Amino acid sequence: MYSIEVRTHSALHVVKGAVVKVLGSEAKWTYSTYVKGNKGVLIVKFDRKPSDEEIREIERLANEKVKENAPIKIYELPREEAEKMFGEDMYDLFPVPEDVRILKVVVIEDWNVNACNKEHTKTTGEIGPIKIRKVRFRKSKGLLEIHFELLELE
Amino acid sequence: MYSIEVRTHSALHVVKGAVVKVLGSEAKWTYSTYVKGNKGVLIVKFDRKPSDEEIREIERLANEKVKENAPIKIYELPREEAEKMFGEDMYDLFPVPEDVRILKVVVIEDWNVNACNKEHTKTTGEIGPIKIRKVRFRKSKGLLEIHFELLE
Ligand SMILES: [Zn+2]
Ligand SMILES: [Zn+2]
């Protein structure tokens, strides 16, 4: 088993992938994330407020990735190499300090790659049904908030 | 007198103000800053590559603020007080940690307000002629690089 929070954190990587698939590469940059219990907040850099249909799609695709039970692999390589093997996409808006010479990159094949040092579940199925509760688009900073919560079902 | 670097850092605040005056409020958020000797790099969040004429205006405007010899005031208030007194504009894209309950906000009336703890010149004139050398717009991240160097 996995703690609910380790579960919610993992959902973030899944939700991010769904976001990029639906909104495109322009929403590929993460600004920040927060997790509290079964609730999660993914803020990505974007330029508009997604339509209700797109939100639905992000949700659908995110839940489909959960059911596929895809593995969440975690490679540990040299900054330089990882830099060339995964490219710029493994990062967020905010750079991982340069004092760090070795990176732990989380990968969900064809979905999301991110230098992350936190604990993740071994597979996407271990996350469970995800529900997007609120979506806020902050015009000034041009950031998109995707609020979601995991579900106490089975 | 002031160190060349203290000068270049101060120019940052001046250049940022010129950038917002010319490009608008959408270029109001700073992503990062770098200063080495007489060289300075201001990266702001933006969506397009400014035209050559706009770059010229940013430069002009920036140098005119230098000649006005405006004072660079430095207020030190609680964070809750600066929050309401200067609003969100005093910040950058990345927030000053919440462990800091007292802020040092740099202000150049009607030009730029920024929570900054570094050393600044007492007035804009003490900066000197600014020259924008290169401007790079990185489409992926949507960031605009304003490269400039002081002349002294
Ligand atoms: Zn992670
Ligand atoms: Zn400063």
mmCIF file of C-alpha atoms and ligand atoms in Angstrom:
data_model
loop_
_atom_site.group_PDB
_atom_site.id
_atom_site.type_symbol
_atom_site.label_atom_id
_atom_site.label_comp_id
_atom_site.label_asym_id
_atom_site.label_seq_id
_atom_site.Cartn_x
_atom_site.Cartn_y
_atom_site.Cartn_z
ATOM 1 C CA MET A 1 0.000 0.000 0.000
ATOM 2 C CA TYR A 2 0.824 3.678 -0.303
ATOM 3 C CA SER A 3 0.097 6.741 1.811
ATOM 4 C CA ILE A 4 -2.667 8.911 0.418
ATOM 5 C CA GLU A 5 -0.246 11.771 -0.029
ATOM 6 C CA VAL A 6 2.373 9.740 -1.891
ATOM 7 C CA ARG A 7 -0.590 8.796 -4.058
ATOM 8 C CA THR A 8 -1.703 12.404 -4.584
ATOM 9 C CA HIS A 9 1.845 13.483 -5.405
ATOM 10 C CA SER A 10 2.023 10.794 -8.077
ATOM 11 C CA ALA A 11 -1.273 11.985 -9.529
ATOM 12 C CA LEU A 12 0.455 15.326 -10.188
ATOM 13 C CA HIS A 13 2.733 13.719 -12.781
ATOM 14 C CA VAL A 14 -0.261 11.976 -14.290
ATOM 15 C CA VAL A 15 -2.362 15.155 -14.363
ATOM 16 C CA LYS A 16 0.558 17.095 -15.882
ATOM 17 C CA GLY A 17 0.785 14.629 -18.749
ATOM 18 C CA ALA A 18 -2.947 14.876 -19.438
ATOM 19 C CA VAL A 19 -2.619 18.682 -19.382
ATOM 20 C CA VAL A 20 0.144 18.675 -21.989
ATOM 21 C CA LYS A 21 -1.724 16.187 -24.186
ATOM 22 C CA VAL A 22 -4.868 18.323 -24.254
ATOM 23 C CA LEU A 23 -3.492 21.874 -24.082
ATOM 24 C CA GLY A 24 -0.277 21.305 -25.971
ATOM 25 C CA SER A 25 3.384 22.104 -25.372
ATOM 26 C CA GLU A 26 2.659 25.641 -24.188
ATOM 27 C CA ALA A 27 1.323 24.306 -20.904
ATOM 28 C CA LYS A 28 4.381 22.091 -20.465
ATOM 29 C CA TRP A 29 5.990 24.305 -17.833
ATOM 30 C CA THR A 30 5.110 23.796 -14.192
ATOM 31 C CA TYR A 31 5.147 26.816 -11.901
ATOM 32 C CA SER A 32 4.453 25.068 -8.640
ATOM 33 C CA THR A 33 2.640 22.216 -6.943
ATOM 34 C CA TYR A 34 1.070 21.509 -3.615
ATOM 35 C CA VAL A 35 -0.343 18.403 -1.994
ATOM 36 C CA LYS A 36 -2.357 18.063 1.187
ATOM 37 C CA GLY A 37 -3.866 14.717 2.033
ATOM 38 C CA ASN A 38 -6.043 13.669 -0.907
ATOM 39 C CA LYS A 39 -5.992 17.134 -2.501
ATOM 40 C CA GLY A 40 -3.541 18.330 -5.123
ATOM 41 C CA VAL A 41 -2.833 21.609 -6.919
ATOM 42 C CA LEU A 42 -0.928 21.772 -10.185
ATOM 43 C CA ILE A 43 -0.091 25.255 -11.452
ATOM 44 C CA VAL A 44 1.249 25.393 -14.959
ATOM 45 C CA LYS A 45 2.297 28.387 -17.067
ATOM 46 C CA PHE A 46 -0.429 29.050 -19.639
ATOM 47 C CA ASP A 47 -2.162 31.838 -21.544
ATOM 48 C CA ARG A 48 -5.906 31.155 -21.411
ATOM 49 C CA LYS A 49 -8.716 29.596 -19.420
ATOM 50 C CA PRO A 50 -9.331 26.088 -20.827
ATOM 51 C CA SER A 51 -12.874 25.359 -21.956
ATOM 52 C CA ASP A 52 -15.137 23.118 -19.908
ATOM 53 C CA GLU A 53 -14.716 20.482 -22.607
ATOM 54 C CA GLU A 54 -10.929 20.554 -22.392
ATOM 55 C CA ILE A 55 -11.056 20.273 -18.615
ATOM 56 C CA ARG A 56 -13.235 17.186 -19.096
ATOM 57 C CA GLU A 57 -10.680 15.757 -21.477
ATOM 58 C CA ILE A 58 -7.767 16.419 -19.129
ATOM 59 C CA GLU A 59 -9.713 14.566 -16.467
ATOM 60 C CA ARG A 60 -10.714 11.675 -18.749
ATOM 61 C CA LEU A 61 -7.187 11.213 -20.132
ATOM 62 C CA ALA A 62 -5.754 11.498 -16.622
ATOM 63 C CA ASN A 63 -8.019 8.750 -15.329
ATOM 64 C CA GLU A 64 -7.319 6.594 -18.393
ATOM 65 C CA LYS A 65 -3.621 6.780 -17.603
ATOM 66 C CA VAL A 66 -4.448 5.545 -14.112
ATOM 67 C CA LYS A 67 -6.341 2.516 -15.419
ATOM 68 C CA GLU A 68 -3.510 1.634 -17.793
ATOM 69 C CA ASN A 69 -1.454 1.006 -14.674
ATOM 70 C CA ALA A 70 1.679 2.389 -16.396
ATOM 71 C CA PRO A 71 4.918 2.101 -14.432
ATOM 72 C CA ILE A 72 6.448 5.199 -12.840
ATOM 73 C CA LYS A 73 10.133 4.580 -13.505
ATOM 74 C CA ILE A 74 12.775 6.532 -11.607
ATOM 75 C CA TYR A 75 16.171 6.922 -13.263
ATOM 76 C CA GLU A 76 19.164 8.340 -11.385
ATOM 77 C CA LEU A 77 21.813 9.846 -13.669
ATOM 78 C CA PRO A 78 24.394 12.656 -14.102
ATOM 79 C CA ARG A 79 22.934 16.116 -14.715
ATOM 80 C CA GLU A 80 24.814 16.424 -17.987
ATOM 81 C CA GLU A 81 23.655 13.060 -19.330
ATOM 82 C CA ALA A 82 20.069 13.351 -18.083
ATOM 83 C CA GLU A 83 20.117 16.787 -19.652
ATOM 84 C CA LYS A 84 20.834 15.143 -23.017
ATOM 85 C CA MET A 85 18.743 12.036 -22.525
ATOM 86 C CA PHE A 86 15.520 13.763 -21.481
ATOM 87 C CA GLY A 87 16.193 17.290 -22.613
ATOM 88 C CA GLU A 88 14.657 20.481 -21.203
ATOM 89 C CA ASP A 89 11.231 18.924 -20.606
ATOM 90 C CA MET A 90 12.294 17.147 -17.439
ATOM 91 C CA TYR A 91 12.450 20.545 -15.726
ATOM 92 C CA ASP A 92 9.983 23.125 -14.453
ATOM 93 C CA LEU A 93 10.005 26.906 -14.645
ATOM 94 C CA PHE A 94 12.136 27.014 -11.493
ATOM 95 C CA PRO A 95 15.599 25.386 -12.082
ATOM 96 C CA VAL A 96 16.937 22.638 -9.834
ATOM 97 C CA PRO A 97 19.925 24.389 -8.136
ATOM 98 C CA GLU A 98 23.328 23.964 -9.792
ATOM 99 C CA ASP A 99 24.851 22.593 -6.604
ATOM 100 C CA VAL A 100 23.083 19.342 -7.548
ATOM 101 C CA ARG A 101 25.329 17.284 -9.838
ATOM 102 C CA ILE A 102 23.201 14.129 -9.936
ATOM 103 C CA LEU A 103 19.510 13.990 -10.801
ATOM 104 C CA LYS A 104 16.598 11.694 -9.973
ATOM 105 C CA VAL A 105 14.289 11.888 -12.979
ATOM 106 C CA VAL A 106 10.757 10.482 -12.791
ATOM 107 C CA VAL A 107 9.418 9.061 -16.034
ATOM 108 C CA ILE A 108 6.065 7.855 -17.266
ATOM 109 C CA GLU A 109 6.814 6.813 -20.835
ATOM 110 C CA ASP A 110 5.196 9.114 -23.414
ATOM 111 C CA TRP A 111 3.484 11.095 -20.681
ATOM 112 C CA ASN A 112 5.718 13.003 -18.305
ATOM 113 C CA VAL A 113 9.390 13.326 -17.374
ATOM 114 C CA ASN A 114 10.402 15.373 -14.353
ATOM 115 C CA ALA A 115 13.448 15.747 -12.147
ATOM 116 C CA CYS A 116 11.810 14.864 -8.822
ATOM 117 C CA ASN A 117 13.235 13.727 -5.507
ATOM 118 C CA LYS A 118 9.963 12.897 -3.728
ATOM 119 C CA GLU A 119 8.442 9.439 -3.168
ATOM 120 C CA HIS A 120 6.205 8.095 -5.953
ATOM 121 C CA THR A 121 3.991 5.033 -6.337
ATOM 122 C CA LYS A 122 5.377 2.160 -8.430
ATOM 123 C CA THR A 123 2.569 2.368 -11.013
ATOM 124 C CA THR A 124 -0.177 4.721 -12.126
ATOM 125 C CA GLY A 125 -2.960 2.365 -11.118
ATOM 126 C CA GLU A 126 -1.869 2.745 -7.498
ATOM 127 C CA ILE A 127 -3.110 6.335 -7.607
ATOM 128 C CA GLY A 128 -6.796 5.759 -8.198
ATOM 129 C CA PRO A 129 -9.678 7.777 -9.717
ATOM 130 C CA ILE A 130 -8.817 11.478 -9.993
ATOM 131 C CA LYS A 131 -11.323 14.333 -9.922
ATOM 132 C CA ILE A 132 -10.641 17.887 -11.045
ATOM 133 C CA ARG A 133 -12.553 20.125 -8.655
ATOM 134 C CA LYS A 134 -11.541 23.638 -9.719
ATOM 135 C CA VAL A 135 -9.524 25.283 -12.473
ATOM 136 C CA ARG A 136 -8.349 28.874 -12.046
ATOM 137 C CA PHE A 137 -6.641 30.953 -14.758
ATOM 138 C CA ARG A 138 -4.743 33.922 -13.306
ATOM 139 C CA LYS A 139 -4.428 36.468 -16.146
ATOM 140 C CA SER A 140 -1.742 38.655 -14.596
ATOM 141 C CA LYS A 141 0.931 35.979 -14.108
ATOM 142 C CA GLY A 142 -0.444 33.801 -16.896
ATOM 143 C CA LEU A 143 -0.652 30.716 -14.717
ATOM 144 C CA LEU A 144 -3.237 27.930 -14.786
ATOM 145 C CA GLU A 145 -4.385 26.236 -11.569
ATOM 146 C CA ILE A 146 -5.628 22.649 -11.823
ATOM 147 C CA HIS A 147 -7.210 21.627 -8.514
ATOM 148 C CA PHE A 148 -7.928 17.909 -8.143
ATOM 149 C CA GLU A 149 -8.649 15.305 -5.478
ATOM 150 C CA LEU A 150 -8.137 11.525 -5.354
ATOM 151 C CA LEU A 151 -11.113 9.343 -4.432
ATOM 152 C CA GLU A 152 -11.833 7.140 -1.441
ATOM 153 C CA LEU A 153 -13.614 4.522 -3.567
ATOM 154 C CA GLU A 154 -12.586 0.832 -3.476
ATOM 155 C CA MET B 1 31.152 56.592 -4.992
ATOM 156 C CA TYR B 2 29.719 53.131 -5.599
ATOM 157 C CA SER B 3 31.065 49.786 -6.772
ATOM 158 C CA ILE B 4 30.529 49.054 -10.429
ATOM 159 C CA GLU B 5 28.380 46.052 -9.514
ATOM 160 C CA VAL B 6 26.221 47.915 -6.992
ATOM 161 C CA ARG B 7 25.673 50.255 -9.923
ATOM 162 C CA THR B 8 24.796 47.521 -12.403
ATOM 163 C CA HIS B 9 22.383 45.947 -9.913
ATOM 164 C CA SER B 10 20.649 49.292 -9.519
ATOM 165 C CA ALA B 11 20.362 49.581 -13.292
ATOM 166 C CA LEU B 12 18.236 46.415 -13.166
ATOM 167 C CA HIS B 13 15.470 48.231 -11.337
ATOM 168 C CA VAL B 14 15.717 51.094 -13.817
ATOM 169 C CA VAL B 15 15.712 48.821 -16.854
ATOM 170 C CA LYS B 16 12.739 46.847 -15.473
ATOM 171 C CA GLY B 17 10.740 50.077 -15.156
ATOM 172 C CA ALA B 18 11.507 51.048 -18.742
ATOM 173 C CA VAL B 19 10.494 47.547 -19.857
ATOM 174 C CA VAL B 20 7.101 47.763 -18.193
ATOM 175 C CA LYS B 21 6.527 51.295 -19.509
ATOM 176 C CA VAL B 22 7.208 50.177 -23.096
ATOM 177 C CA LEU B 23 5.916 46.616 -23.159
ATOM 178 C CA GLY B 24 3.096 46.960 -20.674
ATOM 179 C CA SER B 25 1.979 45.118 -17.551
ATOM 180 C CA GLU B 26 2.446 41.710 -19.172
ATOM 181 C CA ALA B 27 6.194 42.111 -18.874
ATOM 182 C CA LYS B 28 5.899 43.111 -15.199
ATOM 183 C CA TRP B 29 7.071 39.773 -13.805
ATOM 184 C CA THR B 30 10.767 39.092 -13.352
ATOM 185 C CA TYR B 31 12.023 35.530 -13.796
ATOM 186 C CA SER B 32 15.652 36.080 -12.850
ATOM 187 C CA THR B 33 18.538 38.513 -12.669
ATOM 188 C CA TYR B 34 22.308 38.267 -13.171
ATOM 189 C CA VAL B 35 25.054 40.855 -12.609
ATOM 190 C CA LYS B 36 28.764 40.552 -13.380
ATOM 191 C CA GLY B 37 30.930 43.612 -13.246
ATOM 192 C CA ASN B 38 29.432 46.187 -15.624
ATOM 193 C CA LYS B 39 27.160 43.647 -17.320
ATOM 194 C CA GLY B 40 23.563 42.926 -16.359
ATOM 195 C CA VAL B 41 20.890 40.483 -17.486
ATOM 196 C CA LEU B 42 17.194 40.980 -16.780
ATOM 197 C CA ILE B 43 14.909 38.109 -17.731
ATOM 198 C CA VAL B 44 11.221 38.901 -17.619
ATOM 199 C CA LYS B 45 8.192 36.747 -18.418
ATOM 200 C CA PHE B 46 6.889 37.770 -21.820
ATOM 201 C CA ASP B 47 5.190 36.417 -24.936
ATOM 202 C CA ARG B 48 6.950 37.897 -27.960
ATOM 203 C CA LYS B 49 10.190 39.316 -29.307
ATOM 204 C CA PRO B 50 10.100 43.133 -28.901
ATOM 205 C CA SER B 51 10.658 45.103 -32.093
ATOM 206 C CA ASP B 52 13.919 46.982 -32.682
ATOM 207 C CA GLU B 53 12.050 50.242 -32.067
ATOM 208 C CA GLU B 54 10.666 49.079 -28.753
ATOM 209 C CA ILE B 55 14.151 48.005 -27.678
ATOM 210 C CA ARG B 56 15.343 51.511 -28.533
ATOM 211 C CA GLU B 57 12.580 53.035 -26.414
ATOM 212 C CA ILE B 58 13.345 50.776 -23.453
ATOM 213 C CA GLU B 59 16.923 51.983 -23.720
ATOM 214 C CA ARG B 60 16.043 55.670 -24.139
ATOM 215 C CA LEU B 61 13.472 55.617 -21.338
ATOM 216 C CA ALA B 62 15.954 53.768 -19.118
ATOM 217 C CA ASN B 63 18.677 56.353 -19.720
ATOM 218 C CA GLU B 64 16.265 59.232 -19.194
ATOM 219 C CA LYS B 65 15.409 57.850 -15.767
ATOM 220 C CA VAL B 66 19.140 57.839 -15.092
ATOM 221 C CA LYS B 67 19.472 61.521 -15.933
ATOM 222 C CA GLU B 68 16.438 62.472 -13.838
ATOM 223 C CA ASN B 69 18.579 61.326 -10.900
ATOM 224 C CA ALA B 70 15.493 59.965 -9.122
ATOM 225 C CA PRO B 71 16.019 58.653 -5.600
ATOM 226 C CA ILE B 72 15.999 54.905 -4.928
ATOM 227 C CA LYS B 73 14.086 54.764 -1.643
ATOM 228 C CA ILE B 74 14.339 51.676 0.546
ATOM 229 C CA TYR B 75 11.400 51.025 2.874
ATOM 230 C CA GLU B 76 11.507 48.275 5.527
ATOM 231 C CA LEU B 77 8.099 47.104 6.661
ATOM 232 C CA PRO B 78 6.358 43.995 7.896
ATOM 233 C CA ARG B 79 5.397 41.738 4.991
ATOM 234 C CA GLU B 80 1.661 42.164 5.735
ATOM 235 C CA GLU B 81 2.198 45.894 5.576
ATOM 236 C CA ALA B 82 4.219 45.917 2.393
ATOM 237 C CA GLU B 83 1.707 43.491 0.926
ATOM 238 C CA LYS B 84 -1.092 46.057 1.160
ATOM 239 C CA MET B 85 1.036 49.154 0.671
ATOM 240 C CA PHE B 86 2.711 48.065 -2.593
ATOM 241 C CA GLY B 87 0.543 45.154 -3.659
ATOM 242 C CA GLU B 88 1.688 42.152 -5.693
ATOM 243 C CA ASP B 89 3.828 44.267 -8.050
ATOM 244 C CA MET B 90 6.699 44.368 -5.554
ATOM 245 C CA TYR B 91 7.301 40.647 -6.140
ATOM 246 C CA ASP B 92 8.786 38.522 -8.907
ATOM 247 C CA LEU B 93 7.601 35.276 -10.425
ATOM 248 C CA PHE B 94 9.211 33.449 -7.591
ATOM 249 C CA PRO B 95 8.083 34.419 -4.106
ATOM 250 C CA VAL B 96 10.272 35.440 -1.275
ATOM 251 C CA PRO B 97 10.044 32.517 1.179
ATOM 252 C CA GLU B 98 7.388 32.691 3.893
ATOM 253 C CA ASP B 99 9.982 32.345 6.630
ATOM 254 C CA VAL B 100 10.703 36.038 6.141
ATOM 255 C CA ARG B 101 8.196 38.152 8.097
ATOM 256 C CA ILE B 102 9.887 41.510 7.438
ATOM 257 C CA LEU B 103 10.527 42.914 3.944
ATOM 258 C CA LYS B 104 12.941 45.400 2.439
ATOM 259 C CA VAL B 105 11.194 46.933 -0.568
ATOM 260 C CA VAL B 106 13.082 49.059 -3.082
ATOM 261 C CA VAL B 107 11.075 51.860 -4.633
ATOM 262 C CA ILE B 108 11.607 54.239 -7.545
ATOM 263 C CA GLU B 109 8.407 56.315 -7.558
ATOM 264 C CA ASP B 110 6.158 55.572 -10.557
ATOM 265 C CA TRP B 111 8.780 53.240 -12.027
ATOM 266 C CA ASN B 112 9.504 50.054 -10.077
ATOM 267 C CA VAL B 113 8.838 48.522 -6.652
ATOM 268 C CA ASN B 114 10.624 45.339 -5.676
ATOM 269 C CA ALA B 115 11.266 43.372 -2.495
ATOM 270 C CA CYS B 116 15.056 43.433 -2.627
ATOM 271 C CA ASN B 117 17.693 42.893 0.056
ATOM 272 C CA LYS B 118 20.791 43.799 -2.005
ATOM 273 C CA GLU B 119 22.708 47.088 -1.878
ATOM 274 C CA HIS B 120 21.481 49.873 -4.155
ATOM 275 C CA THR B 121 22.784 53.304 -5.183
ATOM 276 C CA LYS B 122 21.061 56.255 -3.452
ATOM 277 C CA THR B 123 19.908 57.757 -6.758
ATOM 278 C CA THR B 124 19.358 56.809 -10.413
ATOM 279 C CA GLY B 125 22.001 59.209 -11.699
ATOM 280 C CA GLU B 126 24.697 57.327 -9.799
ATOM 281 C CA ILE B 127 24.119 54.476 -12.266
ATOM 282 C CA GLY B 128 25.237 56.131 -15.465
ATOM 283 C CA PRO B 129 24.555 55.579 -19.188
ATOM 284 C CA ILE B 130 22.991 52.153 -19.870
ATOM 285 C CA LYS B 131 23.403 50.247 -23.134
ATOM 286 C CA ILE B 132 21.275 47.281 -24.159
ATOM 287 C CA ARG B 133 23.594 44.860 -25.974
ATOM 288 C CA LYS B 134 21.373 41.882 -26.715
ATOM 289 C CA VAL B 135 17.747 40.847 -26.319
ATOM 290 C CA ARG B 136 16.725 37.210 -26.557
ATOM 291 C CA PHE B 137 13.175 35.877 -26.536
ATOM 292 C CA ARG B 138 12.960 32.203 -25.621
ATOM 293 C CA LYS B 139 9.653 30.941 -27.018
ATOM 294 C CA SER B 140 9.461 27.698 -25.026
ATOM 295 C CA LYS B 141 9.518 29.221 -21.552
ATOM 296 C CA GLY B 142 8.131 32.523 -22.763
ATOM 297 C CA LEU B 143 10.895 34.560 -21.158
ATOM 298 C CA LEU B 144 12.547 37.735 -22.462
ATOM 299 C CA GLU B 145 16.255 38.404 -21.893
ATOM 300 C CA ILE B 146 17.396 42.016 -21.746
ATOM 301 C CA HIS B 147 21.207 42.166 -21.865
ATOM 302 C CA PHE B 148 22.736 45.533 -20.972
ATOM 303 C CA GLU B 149 26.016 47.040 -19.798
ATOM 304 C CA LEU B 150 26.838 50.246 -17.939
ATOM 305 C CA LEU B 151 29.414 52.630 -19.378
ATOM 306 C CA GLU B 152 31.965 53.556 -16.678
HETATM 307 ZN ZN ZN C 1 7.124 13.703 -8.269
HETATM 308 ZN ZN ZN C 2 17.929 45.588 -6.225
#
